[PDB]
């Protein structure tokens, strides 16, 4: 895994795997303020046990989301995935 607690956005960082679908999944919100969105800083993502923190790309708009593998609910088959809708506030 990378040093970052998050994978990719949806192409940004690296086109790892463009495929939204799985199980044991979670729906959350990425709270990105308009300043951090423009400059491309970092923001927190709500997760199970603790928080994630992703590097926001410069000048991000809302309606995007993170796809995070192993950040959805813990299950007897391992863990699920976490899709969290980006808001620019």
From Swiss-Prot:
Taxonomically, the superkingdom here is: Bacteria
GO cellular component term of the entry, any: cytoplasm
* Chief location category: cytoplasm
One GO MF term, please? unfolded protein binding
Keyword annotations for this protein, in alphabetical order, are: Chaperone, Cytoplasm, DNA replication, Stress response
Indicate yes or no for the key word Coiled coil: no
Asked whether the keyword RNA-binding is assigned, the reply is no
The cellular location(s) given in this protein's UniProt record come to: Cytoplasm
- GO BP terms, alphabetized: chaperone cofactor-dependent protein refolding; DNA replication; protein refolding
Spell out the family assignment given in the record's similarity comment.
Belongs to the DnaJ family.
How it assembles, according to the record, is: Forms a heterononamer with DnaJ and DafA in the resting state. Three copies of each protein are present in the complex.
Reported function: Does not influence ATP binding or hydrolysis nor ADP release. Exerts influence on the interaction of DnaK with substrates; in the presence of DafA, DnaJ inhibits substrate binding, and substrate already bound to DnaK is displaced by DnaJ and DafA.
Q: What is this protein called?
A: Chaperone protein DnaJ 2
Its ancestry begins with: Bacteria, Thermotogati, Deinococcota, Deinococci, Thermales
| Gene transcribed to yield this protein | dnaJ2
């Amino acid at each position: 895994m990378e040093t970052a607690t998050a994978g990719e956005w949806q192409g940004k960082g690296s086109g790892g795997s463009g495929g939204s679908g799985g199980s044991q999944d979670l729906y959350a919100t990425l709270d990105v303020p308009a300043p951090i969105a423009v400059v491309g800083g970092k923001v927190r993502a709500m997760t199970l046990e603790g928080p994630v923190e992703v590097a926001v790309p410069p000048r991000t708009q809302a309606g995007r989301k993170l796809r995070l593998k192993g950040k959805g609910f813990p299950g007897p088959a391992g863990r699920g995935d976490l899709y969290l809708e980006v808001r620019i506030t």
